[PDB]
């Protein structure tokens, strides 16, 4: 047997009181009034969970599975990486990532306290010296918001000091790595707007375009001890300081391949065999694995022409199609392979012949045209998680606000625009809060944002006409207003109310504010202002986004 994890009967606790229904709010009922259909997971049903996530895996690899590994060892070969000081690595700790075991906290790290730097230093050391003993972690049951239940997601971590060591061996190889190794195939590299255009060129070059999304069932639970070895392989052929290199070693040793579970109470819950879900490496880690797999299934299944899309467990494959029944024993043949390499499917493939069916990480692309006349291809999602999300964020303070990132991260679609950016700006303009910076995260990673930078962050990340689509698909205005009639949100000609309003005052305000009342809100006149590029937009540093953190979020970078 070879179980991802092993219990002792100890409980998953909290660390504080879990609610889990949405708070009725004034200003949240305005958003959305069907509040009983909104709720948040909490450790009560951590163990329906555990049940989920423990099973045997079974592994056999072949010959495309190591000629792809000599593959991408020869790519890693021609990556060179440097250690982060404790300084550095500090500076990208979030200020709300979780307290110290030994005596410190966030806050700390982030000041460069003596007590927080000389405690990292101690850790360091120790992975220096020692290569075997293998790490604590502590296993939590995640809060996370859905409409309807989901049981919650597990989140396994090392202390606070271990993730700072984890950011100064590893950071730049997290950071440098996957693009050496996969090329085009990387998913994180790109942002939304080159992600649609990577897409559709891969999709319109084929001559009958065939795509698919592989979903791997309890991807972290798959990952066994030799792929987690294969991975510090890979890590191994960079040119990385002698230090780097020991403390690579260690970690994968002590930390990554396994270790032992405790919960809040410090009580040992269990030991882990599998990957750990809050590691530095869990993103990089599984995008590497995942594409090794996937890389290796479509040679075994012969698959023509493939262009793979990896971000994390996410895969999606766009090739030739060989004909229907072809095509169909061709997925087969790949979900055979990949199974085989201990990736086996939750709903098994199925061949999509229209771009816009395709639903990866959560999201599918949809068309528009701009002010120009111009198509557009853009990423778009049900709006349901968002909707609800953003409830509840309106009646509770969050420390991470997800809203922010969706507005960010959809920025063209008709929902983002009209209802999230709509509700929020009239917030804040009421609350007197524009220029406050806020958390929010974007793949997986925690930003510090300021709302009224947002015309400028939309043009750098999805261009010029994100804020002017017009003729949305049928099937995406049938999908808000499905999702608005559950969820008792106001009919967007509502929000075209409230966004007239918001847009006067913003202008009102001058300076940046009315940047924002011009560009985010142009849709909702009739006497449209001509919106040209935003000459500040190329000031943006956006050289240090879009490193994946999912999922224990443990990165932290300020727009500067
Ligand atoms: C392998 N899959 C992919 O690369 C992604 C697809 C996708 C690909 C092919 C397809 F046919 C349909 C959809 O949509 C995405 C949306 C996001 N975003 C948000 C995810 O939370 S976003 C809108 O910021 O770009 C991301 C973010 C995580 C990097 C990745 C992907």
Known sequence: HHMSYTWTGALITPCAAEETKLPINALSNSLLRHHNLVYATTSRS??????????????????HYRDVLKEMKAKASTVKAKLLSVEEACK?????????????????????????????????????????TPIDTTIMAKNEVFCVRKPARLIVFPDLGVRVCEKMALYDVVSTLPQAVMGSSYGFQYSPGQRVEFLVNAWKAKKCPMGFAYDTRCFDSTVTENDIRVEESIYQCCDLAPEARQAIRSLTERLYIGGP?????????????????????????????????????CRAAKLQDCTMLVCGD?????????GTQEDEASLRAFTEAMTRYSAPPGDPPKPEYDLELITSCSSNVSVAHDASGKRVYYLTRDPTTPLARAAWETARHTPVN??????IMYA??????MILMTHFFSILLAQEQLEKALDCQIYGACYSIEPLDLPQIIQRLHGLSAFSLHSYSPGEINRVASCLRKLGVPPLRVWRHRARSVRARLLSQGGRAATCGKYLFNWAVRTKLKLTPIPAASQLDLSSWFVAGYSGGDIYHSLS
């Open 46 to 63: 951590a163990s329906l969970r555990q049940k989920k996530v423990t099973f045997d895996r079974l592994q056999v690899l072949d010959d």
């Open 412 to 417: 063209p679609t008709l929902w983002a625009r």
């Open 314 to 322: 996410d895969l999606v494959v766009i090739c030739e199609s060989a």
């Open 261 to 297: 579970l405790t919960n809040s109470k410090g009580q040992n819950c269990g030991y882990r065999r599998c990957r750990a879900s809050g590691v530095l490496t869990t993103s990089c880690g599984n995008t590497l694995t995942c594409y090794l797999k996937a890389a290796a299934a």
């Open 92 to 132: 990208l700790t979030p200020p709300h990532s979780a307290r110290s075991k030994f005596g410190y906290g966030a806050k700390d790290v982030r000041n460069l306290s003596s007590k927080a730097v000389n405690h990292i230093r101690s850790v360091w050391k120790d992975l220096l010296e020692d290569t075997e």
């Open 402 to 407: 997800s809203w922010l990132g969706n507005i």
